[PDB]
Design a protein around this motif. Structure first.
Motif, mmCIF file in Angstrom:
data_model
loop_
_atom_site.group_PDB
_atom_site.id
_atom_site.type_symbol
_atom_site.label_atom_id
_atom_site.label_comp_id
_atom_site.label_asym_id
_atom_site.label_seq_id
_atom_site.Cartn_x
_atom_site.Cartn_y
_atom_site.Cartn_z
ATOM 1 N N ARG A 125 -1.554 10.732 -77.067
ATOM 2 C CA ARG A 125 -0.862 12.156 -77.317
ATOM 3 C C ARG A 125 0.395 12.235 -76.207
ATOM 4 N NH1 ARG A 125 -3.356 17.882 -77.356
ATOM 5 N NH2 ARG A 125 -1.657 19.255 -76.555
ATOM 6 N N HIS A 126 1.487 12.442 -76.460
ATOM 7 C CA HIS A 126 2.658 12.337 -75.877
ATOM 8 C C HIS A 126 3.989 13.372 -76.274
ATOM 9 C CE1 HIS A 126 3.912 9.772 -79.056
ATOM 10 N NE2 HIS A 126 4.991 9.943 -78.753
ATOM 11 N N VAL A 127 4.722 13.390 -75.761
ATOM 12 C CA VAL A 127 6.023 14.211 -76.232
ATOM 13 C C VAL A 127 7.378 13.228 -75.962
ATOM 14 C CG1 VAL A 127 7.800 16.036 -75.379
ATOM 15 C CG2 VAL A 127 5.358 16.524 -75.445
ATOM 16 N N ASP A 128 7.905 13.281 -77.297
ATOM 17 C CA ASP A 128 8.909 12.621 -77.180
ATOM 18 C C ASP A 128 10.035 12.723 -76.213
ATOM 19 O OD1 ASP A 128 7.953 11.226 -79.425
ATOM 20 O OD2 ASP A 128 9.490 11.690 -80.945
ATOM 21 N N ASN A 129 10.675 14.182 -75.997
ATOM 22 C CA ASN A 129 11.695 14.312 -75.175
ATOM 23 C C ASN A 129 10.931 15.424 -74.111
ATOM 24 O OD1 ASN A 129 13.978 15.115 -73.697
ATOM 25 N ND2 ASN A 129 14.745 16.180 -75.401
ATOM 26 N N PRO A 186 3.891 18.112 -78.985
ATOM 27 C CA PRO A 186 3.005 16.735 -78.715
ATOM 28 C C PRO A 186 2.142 16.348 -79.907
ATOM 29 C CG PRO A 186 2.590 18.713 -77.330
ATOM 30 C CD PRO A 186 3.372 19.270 -78.617
ATOM 31 N N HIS A 187 2.225 14.802 -79.866
ATOM 32 C CA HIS A 187 1.602 14.314 -80.958
ATOM 33 C C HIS A 187 1.009 12.702 -80.519
ATOM 34 C CE1 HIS A 187 5.958 13.363 -80.840
ATOM 35 N NE2 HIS A 187 5.545 11.750 -81.148
ATOM 36 N N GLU A 188 0.091 12.339 -81.487
ATOM 37 C CA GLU A 188 -0.571 11.088 -81.206
ATOM 38 C C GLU A 188 -0.818 10.377 -82.682
ATOM 39 O OE1 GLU A 188 -5.098 10.626 -80.188
ATOM 40 O OE2 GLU A 188 -4.562 12.677 -79.503
HETATM 41 FE FE LIG Z 1 6.493 10.175 -80.476
#
Ligand SMILES: [Fe+3]
Ligand SMILES: O=C(O)CCC(=O)Nc1cc2ccccc2cn1
Length: 222
Positions: A125-129, A186-188
């Motif tokens: 899981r992360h945020v692109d920007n 957020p996405h994974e």
């Molecule tokens: Fe991403």
């Protein structure tokens, strides 16, 4: 369906309402299969990285490696269908000029072509920007023929801010995805047990990139 019709009747309303938009059958079977063939050629030619290190082992031969990437401008030999994909995405965004939020989209990145090898690796899981680096829209194209998440996994799970529920997005063949790049999404990627390809492009809001450029100042001689 023409890009302008798609943009005005679905992408713009849907992005402004939910911040996540899915367009199926974006280019058709012929074009999509040729894109898949070009990406598979790049993989066969060794153009990809070895993949992200997931677990460091002392025998480095036993180290697991996840998502492989390669950067594609779209004019390289044997990549012209990838270039047409990106020109089509550009046409879509251009027809959306000024209508997605308050953003004025003035540029984009090269294409990041990602290959999950199918060895059970995902993406955390992360945020692109997350730090306002100028990217406002993430645009992804999936090219995996007859992908069944139930068998092969690889679902992209987005956790929209302020919403309890998830948004599960299977990496379907000829699928196009848009979502805000910042903290709102957020996405994974759940573990993939088959080879999973995706093509990502990030679009720049003019003002955010303009003021982000300062941190890049470290330039004209005296
Ligand atoms: Fe991403
Ligand atoms: O393949 C998908 O469905 C998208 C998964 C995904 O988020 N990949 C990704 C990969 C990234 C690599 C470097 C820096 C930021 C990154 C952000 N996202």
């Amino acid at each position: 369906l023409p890009a302008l019709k798609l943009a005005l009747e679905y992408i713009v309303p849907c992005m402004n309402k939910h911040g996540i938009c899915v367009v199926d059958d974006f280019l058709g079977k012929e074009t999509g299969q040729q894109i898949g063939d070009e990406v598979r050629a790049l993989h066969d030619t060794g153009k990809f990285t070895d993949g992200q290190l997931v677990s460091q082992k002392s025998d480095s031969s036993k180290d697991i490696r996840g998502d492989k990437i390669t950067w594609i401008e779209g004019k390289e030999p044997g990549c012209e269908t990838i270039g047409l994909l990106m020109s089509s995405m550009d046409d879509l965004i251009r027809h959306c000029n000024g209508k997605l939020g308050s953003y004025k989209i003035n540029g984009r990145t090269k294409a990041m072509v990602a290959c999950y090898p199918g060895n059970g690796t995902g993406y955390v899981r992360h945020v692109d920007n997350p730090n306002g680096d100028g990217r406002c829209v993430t645009c992804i194209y999936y090219l995996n023929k007859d992908w069944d998440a139930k068998v092969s996994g690889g679902i992209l799970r987005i956790f929209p801010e302020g919403k309890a529920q998830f948004a599960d997005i299977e990496p379907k063949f000829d699928r196009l995805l848009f979502f805000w790049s910042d903290r709102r999404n957020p996405h994974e990627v759940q573990p993939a047990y088959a080879t999973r390809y995706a093509i990502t492009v990030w679009y720049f809001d003019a003002d955010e990139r303009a003021r982000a450029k300062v941190k890049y100042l470290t330039r004209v001689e005296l």
